[PDB]
Design a protein around this ligand. Structure first.
Ligand code: 7HE
Ligand SMILES: CC1(C)[C@@H]2CC[C@@]1(C)C(=O)C2
Ligand SMILES: [K+]
Length: 405
């Protein structure tokens, strides 16, 4: 239902958008959120859904809020409030100054040097998975590639057994797109329940995997605590299991639907990195937020201490003020403006790993399976939440149009 309108919010700003089930979802999830950028819609709106909260609807306000951590705090970043309050991942639930000291440690485990360590194996797993599918003439992309490719790279990096994936994937998805069986707090505690013994084991007997590195790490020259390590590792699991996994499906759905765009990349594969950036803009997927630390007037709107404000990345990338014809995918787009990896002091530390997985996937897929389509008659369903995704993506192709490398 709809939470009662707080007295400080005027009626003309009320737009009852539901981030977990947006009314226009059947048009595509990005399209559903873009209803907030129609002609009659102010830059900042109040929804009475999900307990009641603000939504910033334009890149300019989104970027400003991200930059101003004094007024807009990461301490309670997720909607609904109970989820934001429970959320205590590091460094995401912290503001500067305390946040910063934890970035260097996370960078040690998912940053560029690690992407270098994993380079060959990333390449090898993409090729092996795609070659196994190639002669089939069909696949269920979400389960056959989008999930196993990034997830198996992550489990390798984290030194976790692949047999644990179904359990961990289920729990991660309850934090972002809950089925209703578990509250955010329950799902998070279950992920903690998994990590707690593994962290203790690896503090006793360190390995070289990401969990060992975090758990034995130093934070500005002092030892990390067991609790801090757990809160960092929780975030890493969500990053590994529910980010690139969804993004790959949005991208492949688009490419399946656009022979012209496939052809551009088939003919000029050196454009794949630029294509990756334009796809990251167009198929952005995270709805991050903040909590007001004081009463504050922002863009003519009175915000009250404790109000939550959603800062959806879809709305920066799809903002026509920032990107002309924003629903069009243009691989030659000149100035690709987006906040898909965040903005300000919390810029995604996994972004280098993410881009490598995306770029490798596009290159290695189009090399082997240049010509593919959505299964005839299929209707692709999206799902919305803290991270949006694609429920299923049945693809088909003629094996005679494929090439084994
Ligand atoms: C397993 C590592 C990993 C991977 C694969 C990702 N991330 Fe990233 N991320 C993102 C946002 C909006 C923010 C504030 C972060 C912050 C993060 C932070 C916290 C940065 C901070 O709060 O200081 C971490 C550790 C992080 N992200 C690890 C991470 C979005 C993404 C997106 C769109 C992708 C992929 C398409 C992504 N993350 C992959
Ligand atoms: C907001 C994120 C994308 C970032 C990594 C996974 C995620 C949902 C988090 O809890 C932090
Ligand atoms: K919190």
């Amino acid at each position: 239902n709809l939470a009662p309108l707080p007295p400080h919010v005027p009626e003309h700003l009320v737009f009852d958008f539901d981030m977990y089930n947006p009314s226009n979802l059947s048009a595509g999830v990005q399209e559903a959120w873009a209803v907030l950028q129609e002609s009659n819609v102010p830059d900042l709106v109040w929804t009475r859904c999900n307990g009641g909260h603000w939504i910033a609807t334009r890149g300019q306000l989104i970027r400003e809020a991200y930059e101003d951590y004094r007024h807009f705090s990461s301490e309670c970043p997720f909607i609904p409030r109970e989820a934001g309050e429970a959320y205590d991942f590091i460094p995401t639930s912290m503001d500067p100054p305390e946040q910063r000291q934890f970035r260097a440690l996370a960078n040690q485990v998912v940053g560029m040097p690690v992407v270098d360590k994993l380079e060959n194996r990333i390449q090898e797993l993409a090729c092996s998975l795609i070659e196994s599918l190639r002669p089939q003439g069909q696949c269920n992309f979400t389960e056959d590639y989008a999930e196993p490719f990034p997830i198996r790279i992550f489990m390798l990096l984290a030194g976790l057994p692949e047999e644990d994936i179904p359990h961990l994937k289920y729990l991660t998805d309850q934090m972002t797109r809950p089925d209703g069986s578990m509250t955010f707090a329950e799902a998070k505690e279950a992920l903690y329940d998994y990590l707690i013994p593994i962290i203790e084991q690896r503090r006793q007997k360190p390995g070289t995997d990401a969990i060992s590195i975090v758990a034995n790490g130093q934070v500005n020259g002092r030892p990390i605590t067991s609790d801090e390590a757990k809160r960092m590792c929780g975030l890493l699991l969500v990053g590994g299991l529910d980010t690139v996994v969804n993004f790959l499906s949005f991208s492949m759905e688009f490419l399946a639907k656009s022979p012209e765009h496939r052809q551009e990349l088939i003919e000029r594969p050196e454009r794949i990195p630029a294509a990756c950036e334009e796809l990251l803009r167009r198929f952005s997927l995270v709805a991050d937020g903040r909590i007001l630390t004081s009463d504050y007037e922002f863009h003519g709107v009175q915000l009250k201490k404790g109000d939550q404000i959603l800062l959806p990345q879809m709305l920066s990338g799809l903002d026509e003020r920032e990107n002309a014809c924003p629903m069009h995918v243009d691989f030659s787009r000149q100035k690709v403006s987006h906040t898909t990896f965040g903005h300000g002091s919390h810029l995604c530390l996994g972004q280098h790993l993410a881009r490598r997985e995306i770029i490798v996937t596009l290159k290695e897929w189009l090399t082997r399976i240049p010509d593919f389509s959505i299964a005839p008659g299929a209707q692709i369903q999206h799902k919305s939440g803290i991270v949006s995704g694609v429920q299923a993506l049945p693809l088909v192709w003629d094996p005679a149009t494929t090439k084994a490398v």
